[PDB]
Amino acid sequence: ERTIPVPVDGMEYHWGNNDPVRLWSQLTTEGKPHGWPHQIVQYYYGLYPAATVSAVVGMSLLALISIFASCYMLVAARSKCLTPYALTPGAAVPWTLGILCCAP
Amino acid sequence: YEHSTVMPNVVGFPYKAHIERPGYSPLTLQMQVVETSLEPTLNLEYITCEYKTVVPSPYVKCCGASECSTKEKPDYQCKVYTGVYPFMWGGAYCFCDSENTQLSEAYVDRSDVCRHDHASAYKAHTASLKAKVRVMYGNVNQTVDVYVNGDHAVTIGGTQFIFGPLSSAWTPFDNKIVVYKDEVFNQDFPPYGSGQPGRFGDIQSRTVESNDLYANTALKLARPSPGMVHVPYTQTPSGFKYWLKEKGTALNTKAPFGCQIKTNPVRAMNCAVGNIPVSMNLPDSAFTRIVEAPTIIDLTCTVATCTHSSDFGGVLTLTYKTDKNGDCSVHSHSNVATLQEATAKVKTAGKVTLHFSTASASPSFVVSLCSARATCSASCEPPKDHIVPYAASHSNVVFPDMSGTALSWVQKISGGLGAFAIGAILVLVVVTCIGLRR
Amino acid sequence: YEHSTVMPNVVGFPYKAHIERPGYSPLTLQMQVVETSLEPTLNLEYITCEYKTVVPSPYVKCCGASECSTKEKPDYQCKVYTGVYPFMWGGAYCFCDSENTQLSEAYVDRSDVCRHDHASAYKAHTASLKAKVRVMYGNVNQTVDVYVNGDHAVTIGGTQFIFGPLSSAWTPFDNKIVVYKDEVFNQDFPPYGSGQPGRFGDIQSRTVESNDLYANTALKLARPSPGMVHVPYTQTPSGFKYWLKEKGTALNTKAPFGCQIKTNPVRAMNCAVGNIPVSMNLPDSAFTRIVEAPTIIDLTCTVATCTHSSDFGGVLTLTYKTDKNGDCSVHSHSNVATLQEATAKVKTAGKVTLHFSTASASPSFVVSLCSARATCSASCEPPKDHIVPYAASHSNVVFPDMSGTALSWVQKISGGLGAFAIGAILVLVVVTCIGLRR
Ligand SMILES: *[C@@H]1O[C@H](CO)[C@@H](O[C@@H]2O[C@H](CO)[C@@H](O)[C@H](O)[C@H]2NC(C)=O)[C@H](O)[C@H]1NC(C)=O
Ligand SMILES: *[C@@H]1O[C@H](CO)[C@@H](O)[C@H](O)[C@H]1NC(C)=O
Ligand SMILES: *[C@@H]1O[C@H](CO)[C@@H](O)[C@H](O)[C@H]1NC(C)=O
């Protein structure tokens, strides 16, 4: 018994004196391509592993950097708004401002 | 009317080419490739066959001496041996006890079956292409043999077709090849006049009928045994048989792109690579004016079943309103999906059904019937089988439409994050502006 | 022993090669080229020849009509005319005054002489080379036909020679050529199946013996004049004769590098371009031992007369002192001046004379006799003949030696200027140093 790899391009084999025989492979894979995102991811991975892994990690990295940058920008905006009150001797922050933005 | 298109060079794949000019209904031409042939230009270098050794009877001189003169023969070896006492069945051949001399010589010549069993050494060059093409349109069905080189111009039903040139300069043959019976090998060979004993090309000849021969097989002669009459010689075995024993792997079982090698003449068939440009000049008799063509209004498209596979596993229906029964040309404007029929019978019923094949999870493509167009978006489930015997009947494409489910999810996530970022940047802008106004 | 060199590809130029090895006297080889051939490999496209218009006797039907069906013949043209009253020498032909019908047809075929007179279209590819080389050394003087390919290995007197490959892939043939009789033309031709009337390629056949024919000559028929029995036709004259009239200028009187074009097969001869590499393997029997070769001591060279011309216009004298009479190989170790004799005879008198040719005003080189070397430098004068009937026998070198008059004057001027500049620079540096001291 032997095992022969059949890619999507096809395989031709010759055995003895019969005519050579050709075989082709369809695009079958596990998972379902129209459900929750994990099912789609696993279907695509079954069809093409390396490209799908690369795409997923790139998407995750981009989402993470975007969200972290925007959160840091909002924090910096809060700090810039609230700093001039702390440098002022005495005085106080309006309660509306201290409720809208967390002011210790 | 002049037109140009590009068709893939894969055998058995139907091609629909769309033609549309003002003042006439659109038309679709079915073009297919039945077989392709790729032949190189060969110039012979030498041929090789098995050898045979010609050794005549020795010349024994009793009570005397002899000397031999050089001849002009392939690998002529001669020697004179002194002090011999030959014997026979009756008795001593010579009366003199130790004054005899034996002259021996031998040479080599091509075998008596060299015309029927030999291997040829060829040098390959630029290769030309021939093809057989089936053309269908209207009431025209014909197969023609063409040269794909941009020169041949064929006429099918008064329509001029020019093919080629091929878009890839690829050949499987190396510069030097060797041909034997029904096999070609990409093996380099020794140059003429410089063969080596024991290996390929130990005897060389410019052609089968040539009267010259170059032989180098290390013929050596030996002194005859005492009390004996014979001629002993040592010589390396024939290099042709040695080559035949372990020639290697033939190019027939190693040629890429799954294309078949045949000999007499040397050629490679069905070599699937590249694409062929087609230039066409059509007469006005094959078109139909708008006046005698049906008018289609308010036509929309929907899909019934879609399972993307190498077969035609897809059915889509088209609804329309017309004014008279007739025939129309139907076509798909994208290569994501490929249709099967080219002409559709339109009737007053208002519904037609067509088959198609695709290879993406969610294909979106625009179809056209007569002068009207519509869009078709679908979702197709993968097949359950693993191996099929036939080849793919679709162009390979996998990228889904931007309105597909996965694309929809990524678009939603991106839009949410973009709105979040826009809000953050707007807040920063207003904060810094009010701060600077202070 | 194995040696390698390069030799110019000029027909009739005597090349001298020097072989020097430890333990043996130097050897001088003479190599010359007598004829070079350059043949491109060709594939046929079609042939063209004058045509003939075949028209049969007209058909006349009295009181009846006829209709003619198309036939698969080259440019077949058939027509039917109504209302004819043909006349013959006896009188009228039919009672029906206006109920007769005439049927006329004509077509075009190849001439009966097309086999003996045709023009062929060819496509040119990479071209091989053939050469004939004469080699002299010692007592060996032989000519040999070789391929300048890097493949052929020839044996001459126990010595193995290999030529090629050429150092410049240049061919005087365009991609497409047309061959007729004994002339070749670098003209493009219309593609097969796309001939135009009145010019080259009005009729085309794939080969001389083929049966299919493609003709396009605008054979139009016209109605017969009243009271007549004939068939009138207007046809554009044959394009082959028209091409013959003003074909153009042949490549025979236009080919560059001064090489002659011959047909059957298509080839070029004596194309002076590039240089040929030579690889040789000599046996040890062709040399001479040092112990028997004369030893030369105290060798000096003087030049009596010099005149740089295409002839061997220069005489040099060598003085020496030996121990035994003999013959030794003499060579020039530079390129500016080329010698004529390869071997010279040395006697106890101690004076030999040699002839040489040069092209520089002040040639300086090294002359090697047997085993010793000396330097030769002289001054020459130009010749007086403006035009000569033989090719130059010297490699074209014009740059004078550094010891010549012109370069000597340049050196003197440069040295004076440099010394004066150095003096000025030294004075300034001294002044700035003494100033910086304070
Ligand atoms: C002999 O002549 C007569 C008259 O010239 C021919 O009769 C004519 O036949 C054609 C077709 O058969 C008709 O269209 C005409 O109307 C006929 N003419 C008359 C006056 O009737 C007859 O065909 C001729 N026969 C032969 C054998 O020549
Ligand atoms: C075209 O001709 C071929 C050859 O006879 C035939 O097999 C094929 O069915 C024809 N096609 C159509 C659509 O009739
Ligand atoms: C070599 O042989 C040819 C053939 O006759 C002759 O013409 C030529 O002069 C010879 N050369 C020498 C150097 O003897």
XYZ file of N, CA and C in Angstrom, chain B residues 12 29 45 83 86 118 161 218 254 258 295 306 308-309 317 319 331 339 348 361 369 375 377 390 415 422 427:
81
model
N -9.993 21.904 -22.640
C -11.300 21.514 -22.160
C -12.089 22.592 -21.451
N -19.485 34.261 -28.194
C -18.766 33.278 -28.992
C -18.171 32.237 -28.059
N 23.410 15.934 -33.984
C 24.836 16.013 -33.705
C 25.554 14.705 -33.990
N 58.768 -16.222 -31.475
C 58.962 -17.400 -30.658
C 57.670 -18.094 -30.292
N 52.947 -23.206 -32.706
C 51.525 -23.541 -32.805
C 51.299 -25.040 -32.866
N 19.313 2.458 -32.321
C 20.317 3.480 -32.085
C 19.689 4.629 -31.315
N -9.897 35.053 -37.966
C -9.337 34.801 -36.646
C -7.821 34.755 -36.754
N 39.447 1.011 -25.963
C 40.601 0.453 -25.261
C 40.839 -1.006 -25.651
N 8.579 12.906 -15.721
C 9.101 14.018 -14.940
C 8.727 15.383 -15.490
N 2.103 18.566 -16.364
C 1.282 17.446 -16.782
C 1.080 17.326 -18.275
N -37.192 43.197 -26.196
C -36.862 44.222 -25.218
C -37.160 43.698 -23.820
N -26.548 26.771 -4.222
C -25.146 27.036 -4.523
C -24.276 26.148 -3.651
N -20.301 25.238 -4.089
C -19.167 25.475 -4.970
C -18.343 24.205 -5.119
N -18.223 23.736 -6.356
C -17.516 22.507 -6.669
C -17.042 22.595 -8.111
N -32.083 31.765 -11.096
C -33.255 32.039 -11.909
C -33.354 33.534 -12.176
N -36.023 36.614 -13.655
C -37.389 37.034 -13.929
C -37.367 38.288 -14.790
N -24.630 36.380 -20.543
C -23.208 36.358 -20.230
C -22.974 36.843 -18.808
N -20.685 30.702 -16.416
C -21.943 30.120 -16.848
C -21.687 28.918 -17.749
N -42.914 34.576 -22.950
C -43.827 35.448 -22.224
C -44.065 34.988 -20.793
N -16.907 31.441 -1.408
C -18.003 31.189 -0.481
C -19.202 32.070 -0.797
N -28.577 39.697 -19.863
C -29.431 39.008 -20.819
C -29.888 40.023 -21.855
N -27.645 42.148 -11.054
C -26.614 41.674 -10.144
C -27.109 40.444 -9.396
N -25.972 38.029 -5.983
C -25.163 37.720 -4.814
C -25.706 36.448 -4.183
N -12.718 14.445 -12.874
C -12.644 15.473 -13.901
C -11.891 16.700 -13.394
N -15.805 49.839 11.468
C -16.611 51.038 11.621
C -16.793 51.436 13.071
N -12.811 58.537 16.065
C -13.292 59.855 15.665
C -13.795 60.624 16.876
N -12.927 64.951 20.750
C -12.850 65.406 22.135
C -11.519 66.100 22.388
